[PDB]
Design a protein around this ligand. Structure first.
Ligand SMILES: *[C@H](O)[C@H](C[C@@H]1CCNC1=O)NC(=O)[C@H](CC(C)C)NC(=O)OCc1ccccc1
Ligand SMILES: *[C@H](O)[C@H](C[C@@H]1CCNC1=O)NC(=O)[C@H](CC(C)C)NC(=O)OCc1ccccc1
Lengths: 299, 299
């Protein structure tokens, strides 16, 4: 019993973290095979104005990099621009490289953050990509380059490298192709986050978890159809429901259909805060159907 | 920016997990040196009526154990009772044993859980020991023997091995000395959790984190002496405050003294009136001052 937001174990990723320094900047990189990937703002000069990154690369000198795995320093052979990342070729292969892939995550999907400082892992926690392509992380100065990952059947799927914090305190990365999530710029100029909405398909998963754990006080007797709910959602800070086949096994185990949970969601919006669900805010959207099925029933 | 309940990286503990099977029982053990520690109910022939564990040990057949680290099987040399644990001497030293200590945690303290099934880590999350010596876990069948840990200066401090779930779904372990937290029994008979109170010093830490992250709408201009607050606390489900030295740094960073936060707690203890603080709709006691200082300022 219980429901907790968990991270997948971090050991296989920990041995891939390096410290990457250039000039006055220091952040983290991801060392796989004979390449280190890191946010390109490590080569930028200090300025609140816009950075011409092609110019910064044109004046770069390879001997000004300092890249280290612990107290072992890696020699730099070359550098390539990769979107908002640098691909740095080094003279040593990481013998602890796991089997890995890259994958760009989509809104509402969960993954794991390995928060790193000075080229070493400090903390690990699960996150969920919001509708405005930000995550609700915890990062302070020095965290850039911290990776996000999922572990799928022995292969590490890398999906995020940390890049910046917005004025609201939420967090933005790029994928490992160098594409910034949400299209935000890797620039120091002021940008404000897009509007954020609760991810309704994840709220549905959370409410099924609550039923399985014996929480029913919030359950409506009424029903509302998916498309009518979706019309209400986009005026009330919630995302539309697109996928429902994923709920079939949860509806079968609990005896409760999606239309009943959608009506419950509308009512919870009306006395919002009056009571928690399993000790959480009643409209919690950080859990996916997959995470719930794993925690309730196993892998 | 941000505040997240996070775990310390799990890599050094993952290499210590083994699968321990006996008869119809399957759980997890902790392999350090040439010893495997696991909950002694692995040798119980029921978990349904009161168990004479000394008898169970006296009729044990060493060969009926199956202990494995991945696909490496460990030979059992002998078995000793250690409180609510078995101390199993095995024929191989774990070469990946980290530097480690044991320590029994106290109410209000945080640590990390590595949830394990079939002798392998599946998830990691942070917890905080309640005043009734239970934790807010997520565990299903097969999780017993999952360890709790902290890491300090590269030394692993083991403080918990998972033992049982109480009727309400909260979770109980033993320390690595074999002493059950809270004096609960490692017996299948009926047990109910004791009364629980919110840990006020942790609620204070959370409100300081909220201030550092720009959440101030709830902050009282009024204040209340620690004396007066403690009279209210014991009739309102909260612990008394005696240590305020742990807030000196946070009060200096924010300019807000403890007495104003105590008045705010009184106002917020019933509800947040429909608003949120760092995403919460009710007070949380899961964060210590140490976690908050680390996440806001590093170390
Ligand atoms: C890389 O370590 C850093 C991570 C930030 C630092 C504070 N919390 C974080 O997550 N990223 C940057 O400093 C980034 C560099 C740009 C060239 C992309 N800029 C940034 O995040 O500053 C925006 C900001 C505004 C207001 C408060 C805090 C940060
Ligand atoms: C060890 O794997 C197991 C972990 C429980 C199982 C369900 N969630 C857990 O944390 N511990 C026990 O099964 C324990 C055995 C002692 C009483 C000897 N008994 C227990 O936890 O209460 C029984 C129970 C079983 C299944 C669900 C809820 C309670």
């Amino acid at each position: 019993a219980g429901l907790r937001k968990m991270a997948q174990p971090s050991g296989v990723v920990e041995k891939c973290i390096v410290r990457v320094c250039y000039g006055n900047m220091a952040l983290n990189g991801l060392w796989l095979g004979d390449t280190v990937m890191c946010p390109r703002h490590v080569i930028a000069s200090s300025t609140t104005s816009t950075i011409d990154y092609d110019y910064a690369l044109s004046v770069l000198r390879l001997h000004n990099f300092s890249i280290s795995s612990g107290n072992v320093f890696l020699g730099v052979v070359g550098v390539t621009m990769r979107g908002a990342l640098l691909q740095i070729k080094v003279n040593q292969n990481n013998v602890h490289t796991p089997k890995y892939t890259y994958r760009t995550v989509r809104p509402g999907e969960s993954f794991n953050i390995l928060a790193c400082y000075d080229g070493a892992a400090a903390g690990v926690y699960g996150v969920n990509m919001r509708s405005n392509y930000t995550i609700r992380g915890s990062f302070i100065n020095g965290a850039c380059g911290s990776p996000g990952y999922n572990i799928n059947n022995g292969t590490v799927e890398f999906c995020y490298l940390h890049q910046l914090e917005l004025g609201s305190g939420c967090h933005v990365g790029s994928d490992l192709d160098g594409v910034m999530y949400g299209g935000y710029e890797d620039q120091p100029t002021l940008q404000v986050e897009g509007a954020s909405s609760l991810f309704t398909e994840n709220v549905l998963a959370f409410l099924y978890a609550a039923l399985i754990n014996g929480s029913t006080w919030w359950l409506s007797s009424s029903r509302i159809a998916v498309d009518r709910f979706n019309e209400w959602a986009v005026h009330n800070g919630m995302t539309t429901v697109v996928n429902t086949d994923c709920f079939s096994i949860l509806a079968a185990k609990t005896g409760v259909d999606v239309q009943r949970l959608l009506a419950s969601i509308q009512s919870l919006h009306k006395n919002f805060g009056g009571k928690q669900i399993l000790g959480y805010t009643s409209l919690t959207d950080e859990f996916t159907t997959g995470e719930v099925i794993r925690q309730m029933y196993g892998v």
